[PDB]
Amino acid sequence: GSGSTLREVARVTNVKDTEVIYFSVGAVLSGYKVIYDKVTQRSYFIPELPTGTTAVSLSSSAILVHSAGSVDLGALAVSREEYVTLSGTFDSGAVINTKNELLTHTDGKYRWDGTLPKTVAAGSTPATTGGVGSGAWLSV
Amino acid sequence: GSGSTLREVARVTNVKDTEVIYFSVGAVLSGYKVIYDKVTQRSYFIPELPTGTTAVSLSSSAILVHSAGSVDLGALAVSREEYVTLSGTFDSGAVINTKNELLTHTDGKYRWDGTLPKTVAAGSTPATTGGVGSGAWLSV
Ligand SMILES: [Cl-]
Ligand SMILES: [K+]
């Protein structure tokens, strides 16, 4: 439903029901902890924004633009160790859209630190798709 | 409910609502990412199966048989670091049914790498129920 979807996000993020808010242009973001993107069906913690700040846009790269600037919500999720593990592997291929998305390789997972979105072809490894390091793949 | 249960699994697994499917005999598994077992009330990511592949059986040890083969969904969950922490501890005893279930000890958690199911009696430790190592308890 409508109010029930936010309560389910609240249980996963461990905040109160009143602290989750859908993204929508013009919505006041101050006073809330978690925002939910209805299109991508992903949730993110948001920083404490100045009172009255309203939402402008939320990209598929998890960049939230608002009336006081912007914030990379995927990058903020990384600092909070809040990750999404995509289906598939480096073997199957995948598309990385955000900074807090993980792709499983063999012994561990990796996030992409470079340009987004990141297309990973089938039969790939981290070494053959950019290498491991700053601006490339980082283990998680 | 019925459609609401899949939405609640989708939030925990970070997939879209339309990418979760109940397990049922004959259900088409292609195009979906997460399967939900109504009996055990557990969810598992599934591999990308060929178009038209249908489900056959799903055991309490998370063994999925389908029209194109079979897969240990519990082992796939381990490779994706998707675990279930059972209630109780080694001291209280428990029953391990899947490869992605964890039992808590005083120093940390462990998964069972051997034959399933695995019964743990009260007052047990990893050392007295098989030891620690390949084919026995593995720390997680
Ligand atoms: Cl690796
Ligand atoms: K939920």
Q: Between A and B, how many residue pairs show a Cβ–Cβ distance under 8 A?
A: 31
What is the experimental method?
Answer: X-ray
Question: Cβ contacts (< 8 Å) between B80 and chain A: which residues?
Answer: 85, 104
Nearest to A10 by CA among A25, A32, A28, A26: A32
CA distance A51 to B79: 43
Domain boundaries defined on chain B: 2-79, 80-140
CB contact under 8 A, B15 and A87: yes
Topology adopted by domain A80-140: Seminal Fluid Protein  PDC-109 (Domain B) (2.10.10)
User: Which ranges of chain A would DSSP assign to H, the alpha helix?
Assistant: 3-13, 73-79
Q: What spacing in Å lies between the alpha carbon of B61 and ligand 2's midpoint?
A: 24
CA–CA distances in Å: residue A65 to residues A32, A71, A94, A118, B90: 16, 7, 26, 21, 49
Domain B2-79 has CATH 3.30.2020.50: yes
Taking the alpha carbons of A59, A2, B83, B140 in that order, is the dihedral positive or negative?
positive
3-state secondary structure string, chain B? CCHHHHHHHHHHHCCCHHHEEECCCCCECCCCCEEEECCCCEEEECCCCCCCCEEEEECCCCEEEECCEEEEHHHHHHHCCCCEEEEEECCCCEEECCCCEEEECCCCEEEECCCCCEEECCCCCHHHCCCECCCCEEEC
- Indicate the residue of A41, A92, A109 with minimum beta-carbon distance to B10: A41
CA distance A74 to A99: 5
Max distance between CA atoms of chain B, in angstroms, equals 49
**A36, A87, A90, A109: best to mutate for the B interface, most B CBs within 10 A:** A87
Same fold, A2-79 and A80-140: no
Q: Contact B17/B45 with Cβ under 8 angstroms?
A: no
The DSSP 8-state label assigned to residue A130 in this structure reads T
